[PDB]
Structure formats: structure tokens, C-alpha cells
């Protein structure tokens, strides 16, 4: 499975958690930003690796990283 890591630079803009097709990500409470929320990746065994979450992240460089790794049935998107 791919590992989705969220770093300190998250501004809680929710863009990654709704850009994600498989809804791997979710927003959890946090105390380090104005929005008082940070993205987490609980169901990260469902990540296919599409990187639409990295595409939607406004912070520079990136507050969310997808690190492609051991492929499985869920992380390769095979209907067969």
C-alpha cells in the first residue's frame, strides 16, 4: 500500500480530503493552524496513488505526500 503523509505545513484547507477519489483522507482536529484542522490518512490501504491530493494542496512545497510502494489489489485498481 502507498503511504500518505501529512506534514506540519497543512493549513486545514480541506482541499486534499475532497480531491481524493477513494476518500482515504479525513480531517481531524488540530491546534497548529488557523483552521484548527489537519488532514490525516486513516484508510491509507485504499490509496491507489493517483496524487489528486498532492495536486490540490495549496501550501508550498507540499503538506501532503504520497509515497508509492508495495502494490496490492486495492492499490492497483484492478476490477479483475
Amino acid at each position: 500500500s502507498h503511504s500518505v503523509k501529512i506534514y506540519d505545513t497543512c493549513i486545514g484547507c480541506t482541499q486534499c480530503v475532497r480531491a481524493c477519489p477513494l476518500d482515504v483522507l479525513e480531517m481531524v482536529p488540530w491546534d497548529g493552524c488557523k483552521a484548527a484542522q489537519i488532514a490525516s490518512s486513516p484508510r491509507t490501504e485504499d490509496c491507489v496513488g493517483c496524487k489528486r491530493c498532492e495536486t490540490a494542496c495549496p501550501t508550498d512545497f507540499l503538506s501532503i505526500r504520497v509515497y508509492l510502494g508495495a502494490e496490492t489489489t486495492r492499490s492497483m485498481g484492478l476490477a479483475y
Binding site: 496524487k51 495536486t55 490540490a56 509515497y67 508495495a70 496490492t72 489489489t73 492497483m76 484492478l78
Partner: protein, 733 residues
């Protein structure tokens, strides 16, 4: 599930990706599971032993097929007339026409003509019978057996070396400089003075009269007493015939410094003296580094004491950077090996050292092109492992402010200057070529930009070529260089000047306005390949598009369509692009070499000298004119001996265009196509019975970049080998 046992992350995906990536990752020993540095080094060591045995079995097979199926007995009667047979054709597909066409060079079976030049090499080093080659082949079988046993032995836990043994740079440098580069060169000088020079002068020195027949009438006592002039007493006279005794001379070590006037190559005594000098210098250079005893150098002291003001830390902590990193060591090894393979190619055609290999033209062309292609591959691999070092083994903390840190601290400046020089040189080489081409096409060839390559002509004049009218260093016999006033030790100079000023040999070819533009095209190719390679090496740690590429590794596919699109950002993709540019540059230089030598060999040098200055000259006098004998290798009338080369020509075109398929069309199209095919298989009767264990997926992005690169390379090489080998063998034997 079990196949990529070195990596558990590949033994889990139920796809064909694990098969492909198991084959690819199998030799990347750093990424295997349960790998420590010691097990890394020991597995590497035994892999080296297996590869040494591969090399020895390969040369054993070459010897065994020259001995068994080749006409080596017949070829050493008249090497000028008979073509050397490589091995025998045996395939059941041949019709009557192909069997009669491929029966050549005085055989009964269909045979393959050897263009590797092993016949000339075996004839020069004194091998004159099929039994000598058979003994050599069996000896190399036993030597390969010995190295296989050595590798298996050093995988045994009792004989597995420690990490301190592999990280011992000074002792390895001592034993390689002295015992491997110097003792083997000394042993080759011994074979030359004992076996090759005497059997070039006529007498048989086998293993039986090896001890009974001294190489010189004077013994070794003149060698000990210092009176070394007797070994250069009477050199080989300029009417000497190879393989027999007419004006032999009986001098084992001379330094005439020209060419043998009959074999057109260098004198074997000159070769032996060369290897003696090289062995002496390499042996004393292997006593430089500290070992168990007291004298010598420590490399850490040498490196860390080279600190200047304009670099700061200088070379501090470069010993541990090179020693702990295997990709740095492999990059340095491949860079030096690529440089000296280029050197081998550039010297074996102008200074041939084998009997009658300068008069067999196809093997000279094949050897030059072969070694220049190997040199291009090794140089690209040197830069690839520079990039892999910068990804994996580079520590920017220990390498603080030294030369590597300052390489990365200004990479934009030198990448932009390589960009400028490649753009500058490419703009004006294409501008001059298109200008010459357009004004020749407009009926006015007098309007061409024809530039005299005066600098290289001046270099040739300094080496003694007095054709261009310069009288500078060796073209002026009154100068300090030609006389060598303090000693007049120029024993080589009369022979060298007699060899450089003869128009026959390829030594210091005449260089004209058509050579200027192709040298600048070659410089453009070298600079652009270097630009891509260092742009992958220095941007392997990240650019502004992706400030972390060290964590994704070397060969990740992309980074998504975000940040504008990030398709070929990995350093592996710079390897990919520079592989294309390497193949192009070597195509340019081997095209240039081939056409220049087709002018020189045929005597009609005017064809190159007036037609190489514009691009349709390259296109109609080289590509079109010289493939006439190629594509007619099989026509509806019949088949001649250049039929397998015409077939390989078309085969290489097909492999090249399949490479286009992999490089242009990308993975999404093929993945949904395979999804439709998978539906077809799972929903049809009588084929529902057969089910895949590994789910069919399309080839990965980086995998199919590699596959298209492999196709491009293989088809490119096969097409050019077929063309170069059938164009010379079309018109020269």
C-alpha cells in the same frame, strides 16, 4: 509470491508487475531484504567471480569455434585473400539458395565470416595451428572453472571476507597497480619476447622448446650487467616477411616507432618493449600506498591535505565518501573504462598492432564501431551511477564544503553553461549544414561555408605530418623537438615520420573542411549528452519542481499531473534521454568514421572531401549509395552472402519502430485495452477454463520507458552493424 525472494514487497502484488520488477530488481543488491553491508560486499564479490567466468567461457567459445569450425590453418597461408570463418551455420530453415550463398571462404558447410578480428589477433600473438587454439580453449575452460569455484568458495562462511577486507583501498590499489596491471603487462612482454616475436621471425616456440630456446642469442647476463643494447642490436629489417625468416634481426626489444612495412601494423618487438616499459612503471606505482609495513602513502592524508582558498574544505572527507559508496566507485570505474574504450577505438584504427588487420577493412570497421559503442554505454553508465550515488550514498553533512558540496552548490551555473554551449554549437552546426545544403541545392556550391580545421591540421603538423605546410615542432627538422638537442634520443622519429607521411595508413588522416563540421557535430553530441547526464546527476537530489527526489529514489515514474505536470523528472529519465543522445552521437561519429574510411580505402577521398559539407551529400553519397549492395542481399532473382545482413537491416528497423511504440504511447491506453481483453477472456466459452495466476496489467511507466529504450538501442545497433558490415564487405572482400 515466491519468485522475487529478495524483496517481500514484490512477492505480494497479484500482477505481472512482480515478474517484471523481479527481473529488474534482482541485481540491485542494496535494496534486497536482510541485506547488511557485509553481505552486500560478499554477494558482489561472488557475482564478480561468476562474471569473470562468463568472460572466460565467452573467449573459450570464440577460440573453440575458430579452432573447430574455422579455417585458421588455411587463413595463415594467405591472410590477404581468404576470409576468416567465424563458425558454422546450422539451421534447418535454409533453402538450397541460402546454403549455396553462405558457402564461402573455402568451406563445404555454410559458414559465417569473422569480423571480430580474432584471427588477426591469434596470428599476431603467435598461434599458428588448430591444436594451439584447442589447448587455449580447454585452458580457458579450466580457468573459468577455477573462477566459478573461487566464487562458490568465497560464499562459504569460513572464506567470506570481512568488511575491513573490502574497504581496504590501499592494499587493493597496490596489488592491482603492481600485481594486476604491472605483472600481467610484464608477463605479456614475456610472451611477446618468447613466443610471438620468435614465431613472427619463423621458429616454433611451443611449450616444449620454451626452456631450451632462449629468445636472444645473448642470455640474461647482459640484462643483469646493464649492457642492455644487445637486445636492440639488429632490429627487424624493412624487408621482413611475417611468419618466416627473411631479415629477422633477432632483437627482442627495439623502438623503431613506425609500422611494419609488410603487415602494415606495429613491430612486435616495439610492442614488447612497450609492455616492458609499462610493466616497470606500473610495478613501481603499486608501491605507493601504505600496507602492513611502514612505508607508503595513506590516501586520507593525501586527500585531506589538498585544501585551497578557492574551494575551502577541498577534498576533506572524500576518502570515506568514495570508500563507503559503491556507486561512486562504479561511476569512477565506468568513466575511466569508457574513456579508455574510446582510447582503444581511436588507437586501434590509426595504430593497428595486428598482422594484416589494417588490410582487412570490415574487421577494422567492426572493431572501431564496437568499442566506440561500448565506450558510449560505459560513459552513460558512469553518469547514471553518479546520479545513483547522489541519490543514495551522498551525505551532505560529511561532504560539507568540499568539492562535491560545491558541485551541488552551483549546479545551475554549470548546467546553464552546458545549455549555452550545446545550444550555441548546435545552432551553428545545423546553420552551417543547412546553409551549405541550401546553397548547393540552389546550384551554387561555391557559396558554402567551408572552414579549414586549422587547429587539428596544426596538431598533425606538430606530430610530423608535413602535408599542410606548417613547420612547427616535428614538421620542422631544425626545431628543438625534432632534433632533441641534449641527447638526440629520437630513435622512433625516422620510423614515425616515415609512417605518418605515407598516404596509405589511417595514421593521422588528412583533415579537411568536411571534418570540421562533423567534429563540431560530435562536440555538440558530447556536450548535450553530458548536459542531460549531469542534469540528472546534480538534480537527483531535487529541483524546484520537486525538492524531494531523494526519498522517491532513482527511478520513480513521475510525481503526478500536479505542479504543472511532472512526467520525466526522475534522474533515471535523464539517463533515458541521454541514452538517446548517446546513440545519436555515436551514430554521428561512426557514420563519419565509416564514410571517411570508405573514401580512404577506395582511394576516392574526393567523394567525402567535397560531398560531406552538406546534408544531402551525407544522404545520397553515404546512406543511399552504400546501401545499394545491402538491400540487394536477397532480391527475387537470388540470394548472395549479404542476405543475413539485409535481413538484420530490416530486423533492426522493426525493433526501432517497436521502440517508438513503447516511447510514444503510454500506459493508460494500454491498461484500458488490457481491461477489455481481460473481459474477453473471462467471458468466453472454453477459455474460461484457463485462468491467470498473475493478473495481467500493462507495463509500468518506467518499465516501458526502459523497454522502448532497449528496443531503440537494439534495433539501432543491429541496423548499423548490418549496414557497416555489409557495406564494407560489399566492396572490400
Amino acid at each position: 509470491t515466491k519468485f522475487p525472494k529478495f524483496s517481500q514487497d514484490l512477492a505480494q502484488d497479484p500482477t505481472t508487475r512482480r515478474i517484471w520488477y523481479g527481473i529488474a530488481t534482482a541485481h540491485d543488491f542494496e535494496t534486497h531484504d536482510g541485506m547488511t553491508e557485509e553481505n552486500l560486499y560478499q554477494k558482489i564479490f561472488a557475482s564478480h567471480f561468476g562474471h569473470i567466468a562468463i568472460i572466460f567461457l565467452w573467449t573459450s567459445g570464440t577460440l573453440f569455434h575458430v579452432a573447430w569450425q574455422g579455417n585458421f590453418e588455411q587463413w595463415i597461408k594467405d591472410p590477404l585473400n581468404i576470409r576468416p570463418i567465424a563458425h558454422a551455420i546450422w539451421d534447418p530453415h535454409f533453402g538450397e539458395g541460402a546454403v549455396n550463398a553462405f558457402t564461402q571462404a573455402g568451406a563445404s558447410n555454410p559458414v559465417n565470416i569473422a569480423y571480430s578480428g580474432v584471427y588477426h589477433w591469434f596470428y599476431t600473438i603467435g598461434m599458428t595451428t588448430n591444436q594451439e587454439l584447442y589447448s587455449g580453449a580447454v585452458f580457458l575452460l579450466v580457468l573459468a572453472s577455477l573462477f566459478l569455484f573461487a566464487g562458490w568458495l568465497h560464499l562459504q562462511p569460513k572464506f567470506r571476507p570481512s568488511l575491513a577486507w573490502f574497504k581496504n583501498a590501499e592494499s587493493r590499489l597496490n596489488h592491482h597497480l603492481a600485481g594486476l596491471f604491472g605483472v600481467s603487462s610484464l608477463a605479456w612482454a614475456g610472451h611477446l619476447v618468447h613466443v610471438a616475436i620468435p614465431e613472427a621471425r619463423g621458429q616454433h616456440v611451443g611449450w616444449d622448446n620454451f626452456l631450451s630456446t632462449p629468445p636472444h642469442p645473448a642470455g640474461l647476463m647482459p640484462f643483469f650487467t646493464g649492457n642492455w643494447g644487445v637486445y636492440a642490436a639488429d632490429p627487424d629489417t624493412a624487408g621482413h616477411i611475417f611468419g618466416t625468416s627473411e631479415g629477422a634481426g633477432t632483437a627482442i626489444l627495439t623502438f623503431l616507432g613506425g609500422f611494419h612495412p609488410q603487415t602494415e601494423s606495429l613491430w612486435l618487438t616495439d610492442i614488447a618493449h612497450h609492455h616492458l616499459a609499462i610493466a616497470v612503471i606500473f610495478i613501481i606505482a603499486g608501491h605507493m600506498y601504505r600496507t602492513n609495513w611502514g612505508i607508503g602513502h595513506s590516501i586520507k592524508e593525501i586527500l585531506n591535505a589538498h585544501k585551497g582558498p578557492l574551494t575551502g574544505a577541498g577534498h576533506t572527507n572524500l576518502y570515506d565518501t568514495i570508500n563507503n559508496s559503491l556507486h561512486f566507485q562504479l561511476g569512477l570505474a565506468l568513466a575511466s573504462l569508457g574513456v579508455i574504450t574510446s582510447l582503444v577505438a581511436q588507437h586501434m584504427y590509426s595504430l593497428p598492432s595486428y598482422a594484416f588487420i589494417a588490410q582487412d577493412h570490415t574487421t577494422q570497421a567492426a572493431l572501431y564501431t564496437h568499442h566506440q559503442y561500448i565506450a558510449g554505454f560505459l560513459m552513460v553508465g558512469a553518469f547514471a551511477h553518479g546520479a545513483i550515488f547522489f541519490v543514495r550514498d551522498y551525505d551532505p553533512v560529511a561532504n560539507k564544503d568540499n568539492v562535491l558540496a560545491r558541485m551541488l552548490e552551483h549546479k545551475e551555473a554549470l548546467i546553464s553553461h552546458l545549455s549555452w554551449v550545446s545550444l550555441f554549437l548546435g545552432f551553428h552546426t545545423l546553420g552551417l549544414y543547412v546553409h551549405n545544403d541550401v546553397v548547393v541545392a540552389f546550384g551554387t556550391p561555391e557559396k558554402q561555408i567551408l572552414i579549414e580545421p586549422v587547429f587539428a591540421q596544426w596538431i598533425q603538423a606538430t606530430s610530423g605530418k608535413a602535408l599542410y605546410g606548417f613547420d612547427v615542432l616535428l614538421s620542422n627538422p631544425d626545431s628543438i623537438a625534432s632534433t632533441a638537442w641534449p641527447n638526440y634520443g629520437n630513435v622512433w622519429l625516422p620510423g614515425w615520420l616515415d609512417a605518418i607521411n605515407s598516404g596509405t595508413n589511417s595514421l593521422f588522416l588528412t583533415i579537411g573542411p568536411g571534418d570540421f563540421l562533423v567534429h563540431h557535430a560530435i562536440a555538440l553530441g558530447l556536450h548535450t549528452t553530458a548536459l542531460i547526464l549531469i542534469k540528472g546527476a546534480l538534480d537527483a537530489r531535487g529541483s524546484k519542481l520537486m525538492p524531494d527526489k531523494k526519498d522517491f529514489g532513482y527511478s520513480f515514474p513521475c510525481d503526478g499531473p500536479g505542479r504543472g505536470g511532472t512526467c520525466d523528472i526522475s534522474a533515471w529519465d535523464a539517463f533515458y534521454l541521454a541514452m538517446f543522445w548517446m546513440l545519436n552521437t555515436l551514430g554521428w561519429l561512426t557514420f563519419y568514421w565509416h564514410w571517411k574510411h570508405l573514401g580512404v580505402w577506395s582511394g576516392n577521398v574526393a567523394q567525402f572531401n567535397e560531398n560531406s559539407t552538406y546534408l544531402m551529400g551525407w544522404f545520397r553519397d553515404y546512406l543511399w549509395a552504400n546501401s545499394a549492395q545491402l538491400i540487394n542481399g536477397y532480391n527475387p532473382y537470388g540470394v548472395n552472402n549479404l542476405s543475413v545482413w539485409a535481413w538484420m537491416f530490416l530486423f533492426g528497423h522493426l525493433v526501432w519502430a517497436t521502440g517508438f511504440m513503447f516511447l510514444i504511447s503510454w500506459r493508460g491506453y494500454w491498461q484500458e485495452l488490457i481491461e477489455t481483453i481481460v473481459w474477453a477472456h473471462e467471458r468466453t466459452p472454453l477459455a474460461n477454463l484457463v485462468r491467470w495466476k498473475d493478473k495481467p496489467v500493462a507495463l509500468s511507466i518506467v518499465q516501458a520507458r526502459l523497454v522502448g529504450l532497449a528496443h531503440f538501442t537494439v534495433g539501432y545497433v543491429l541496423t548499423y552493424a548490418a549496414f557497416l558490415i555489409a557495406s564494407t564487405a560489399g566492396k572490400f572482400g
